Amino acid sequence: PHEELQYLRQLREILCRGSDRLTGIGTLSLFGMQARYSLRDHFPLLTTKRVFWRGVVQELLWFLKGSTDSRELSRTGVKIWDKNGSREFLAGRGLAHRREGDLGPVYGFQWRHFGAAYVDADADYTGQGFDQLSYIVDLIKNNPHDRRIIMCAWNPADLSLMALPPCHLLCQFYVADGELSCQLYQRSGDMGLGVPFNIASYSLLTYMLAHVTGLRPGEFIHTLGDAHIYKTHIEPLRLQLTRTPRPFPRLEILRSVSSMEEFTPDDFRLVDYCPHPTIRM
Amino acid sequence: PHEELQYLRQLREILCRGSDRLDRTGIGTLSLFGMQARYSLRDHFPLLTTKRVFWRGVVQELLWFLKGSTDSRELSRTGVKIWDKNGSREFLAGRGLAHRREGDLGPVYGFQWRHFGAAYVDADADYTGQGFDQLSYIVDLIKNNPHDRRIIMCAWNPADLSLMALPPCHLLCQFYVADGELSCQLYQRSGDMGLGVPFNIASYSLLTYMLAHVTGLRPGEFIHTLGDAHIYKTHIEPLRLQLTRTPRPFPRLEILRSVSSMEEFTPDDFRLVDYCPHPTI
Ligand SMILES: Cc1nc(=O)c2cc(CN(C)c3ccc(C(=O)N[C@@H](CCC(=O)O)C(=O)O)s3)ccc2[nH]1
Ligand SMILES: Cc1nc(=O)c2cc(CN(C)c3ccc(C(=O)N[C@@H](CCC(=O)O)C(=O)O)s3)ccc2[nH]1
Ligand SMILES: O=c1ccn([C@H]2C[C@H](O)[C@@H](COP(=O)(O)O)O2)c(=O)[nH]1
Ligand SMILES: O=c1ccn([C@H]2C[C@H](O)[C@@H](COP(=O)(O)O)O2)c(=O)[nH]1
């Protein structure tokens, strides 16, 4: 039974039993969902519609950098954070005095410098705040059965400095039988666009962490809070609800990388990815 | 089907195929990673019946949390001693926390809920207007923007971990409103299925009843998401016994008078009817 059917059943449920609720734009939604994806023999990149894999990779490395600069992601060809880094959008957020591309203390800053005072995207933060990436990497290496291997992006005190508050709040990691697993808690999930993307991101993070630590990829567990469908997306989502999953691709890591920071997009080969055609939403 | 059978199934799964691990202090647990159970709050209250749950503790401890107290001496005064061991002068010394008055647990749940991001100095100090008051934040959201997808309270603060007596188990809870009902999901990084988890279920269910009462809504669903779900090997025998017990119907919870603020609840506003658990083990 294909694991992608979990995602497809969740879609089907939200569309059929979801709550119909409206500030700006309207959605169908359910609350509390969990799905499991094996990482042992394949990589759970959804096949019912093509997922922007190039975006997935560039954005994770950009996160892992600690960068909060939407321009630096943009330079690589990935424009998904650009609407949010415009001086116009920032102004609308009451953050007008930002330079272009300064998103505030978003994921990268929270992952590498939690609790630090944010100044701007160009400030040097070395040795400031709590480095969560170094923290979990050390625990996975030297104390793998620890129950506190967590990386959290939710920092309520920093919300008003943020262009957009984080959706995927925290990940926890788990080690058993030489396998590295990961649970992601996502407060909010757009099933039409974000959620396939998000599944891929944290699955990737786990492959990367597994590699760097000498472990094999295990399970990725996806726990949603608000799982929702935007109503404008209903006829394209019914389209994808008709399609049968193709087998998952595999993910190869093309070289020895000793540090989470030394990865490059060319270290990853996506083998045998054959999605159905892209659906625009 | 009776909801407690979710918990008991989880017990059995862990006992049957759980992973046999040791910590770096040598103690053995069986554990599994990634679990979710749903408990209805509408017609009843999910206080577990196959073993008696310390309900007096549940109530006093939560009221204690909601006040922002990080003083174990205060909870202990009520006759509830569950945090006394962690508050002892010797425990804190064992943690490497000198200059600590007895009962000073550090920036734990209460401090995080009320003053997230604030500079902790001590349990007696006064933090008014320091940090981010998450409790007011969520009560406000549930009242004035119930469909917000960021109705979050979080206790995981990486920067404060070395200052805490114990690191938080309940990382965060999220709330959700639909069709006149308040719902809640909790992310728990670590659950002792033997002692902690029944208690923990009662705690956040109770919190949801209180929030529902204060905001003019009916208790909806409580979703319980776990990370490391485990059983200490020493308790396997009493748990075998527990698993033979047939669950009895859940009690109910009546809130006596009208309470207008989350801070004005007293242990007396709560009527538990009728809790008839199998004998304690
Ligand atoms: C309403 C909303 N839903 C989302 O899913 C969402 C996601 C992000 C960030 N994110 C995690 C994204 C992942 C993928 C994206 C995207 O734009 N994909 C395009 C592909 C672009 C292209 O043509 O190359 C798409 O397929 O529409 S955006 C930001 C705001 C959002 N807003
Ligand atoms: C290893 C471990 N497991 C736990 O479950 C745990 C729980 C807490 C805090 N906690 C969340 C607790 C919930 C319930 C508790 C308890 O001891 N209840 C007693 C009541 C004692 C009495 O009635 O006098 C009991 O149920 O027997 S303690 C602290 C450390 C822990 N440590
Ligand atoms: O990584 C992401 C980022 C955003 N979103 C979606 C979820 C919501 O539909 C919207 C964010 O809006 P709020 O939930 O923050 O209001 O974008 C995702 O699914 N994944
Ligand atoms: O509210 C609580 C507090 C603690 N624990 C348990 C979980 C673990 O067995 C232990 C905490 O140890 P660590 O997870 O921190 O190692 O206590 C709970 O189940 N619930």
Residue numbers in the entry:
A (entry chain B): 51 to 72, 75 to 333
B (entry chain A): 51 to 331
Q: Which text from the study accompanies this structure?
A:
TS is an essential enzyme for DNA replication. It catalyzes the transfer of a methylene group from the cofactor 5,10-methylenetetrahydrofolate (mTHF) to its substrate 2′-deoxyuridine-5′-monophosphate (dUMP) and produces thymidine-5′-monophosphate (dTMP) and dihydrofolate (DHF).
For the ternary kTS structure, an excellent density map of the ligands was observed except for the glutamate tail of raltitrexed. The ternary complex of kTS had an open conformation in which the catalytic Cys219 residue did not form a covalent bond with dUMP, which was also observed in rTS. In addition, the sulfhydryl group of ternary kTS was 3.3 Å away from the C6 atom of dUMP. The raltitrexed molecule was observed to bind to kTS at the active site by interactions with Phe104, Ile132, Asp242, Gly246, Phe249, Tyr282, and dUMP. There were less hydrophobic interactions with raltitrexed in kTS than in hTS. The Trp109 residue in hTS was found to interact with C7, C9, and CP1 of the raltitrexed molecule; the corresponding Trp133 residue in kTS did not interact with raltitrexed and was rotated about 60° away from raltitrexed. The distance between the Cα atoms of Tyr282 and Ile132 which were located at ligand binding site of kTS ternary complex was 18.8 Å, whereas the corresponding distance was 17.8 Å in hTS. C-terminal disorder might contribute to the open conformation in ternary kTS and rTS.
